Design a protein around this ligand. Structure first.
Ligand SMILES: Cc1nccn1Cc1cccc(C#N)c1
Length: 185
């Protein structure tokens, strides 16, 4: 891919974060805390999962960013509609306004309904996310493996402004404490 030149500076929106997340001062890193982080509740916060949105809203153009997933056992990444449900249980699917991939129990899957098996030979330490709003495309790249394609959602029906989407995952195992980090351009 030659998508690097649509690079955008993404920062995390504290106000959308699950109340257990800790976002760094620079708003470029997020990790799961071992307790409630002493913030008030609001209608923006993801209640059931360790999720947070980027501050940026996209309704046009081409956008690229990279996320560091080093030493994590579980995570979700991609984009979602600004109007996605925040409270209660839900599945990550394009019908619900999400265009995502994830790692769970040693397998990588795309958030289709039902989910799609991914074929990755080189476990990624960094993921590139490309969005072409007009084309209706969301693509994922393996930065660790020379930028190799992981998955392309095509014919996407965004149906509104898009926000960068992150899930740091639970840490029941004690092996998933590491942060998601937005990588420098
Ligand atoms: C109340 C509770 N029972 C089990 C675990 N937790 C903490 C929790 C719940 C939902 C999302 C997050 C995050 N992020 C943390």
């Amino acid at each position: 891919h030659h998508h690097h030149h649509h690079m955008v500076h993404i920062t995390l929106d504290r106000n959308t974060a699950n109340s257990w997340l800790i976002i760094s001062k620079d708003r470029r890193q997020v990790r799961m805390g071992d307790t409630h982080q002493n913030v008030s509740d609001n209608k923006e916060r993801f209640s059931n999962y360790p999720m947070v949105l980027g501050a940026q809203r996209f309704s046009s153009g081409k956008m690229y960013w990279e996320v560091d997933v080093t030493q994590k056992e579980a995570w979700d990444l991609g984009v979602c509609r600004d109007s996605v449900q925040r409270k209660g249980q839900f599945s990550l699917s394009p019908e619900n306004g999400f265009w995502t991939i994830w790692l769970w129990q040693d397998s990588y899957e795309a958030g289709t309904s039902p989910q799609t098996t991914l074929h990755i030979q080189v476990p990624p330490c960094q993921i590139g996310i490309f969005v072409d709003y007009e084309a209706g495309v969301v693509s994922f790249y393996n930065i660790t493996d020379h930028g190799s394609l992981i998955y392309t959602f095509s014919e996407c029906v965004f149906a509104g402004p898009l926000r960068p989407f992150f899930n740091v995952g639970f840490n029941y195992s004690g092996g998933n404490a590491a942060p998601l980090k937005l990588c420098p351009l």
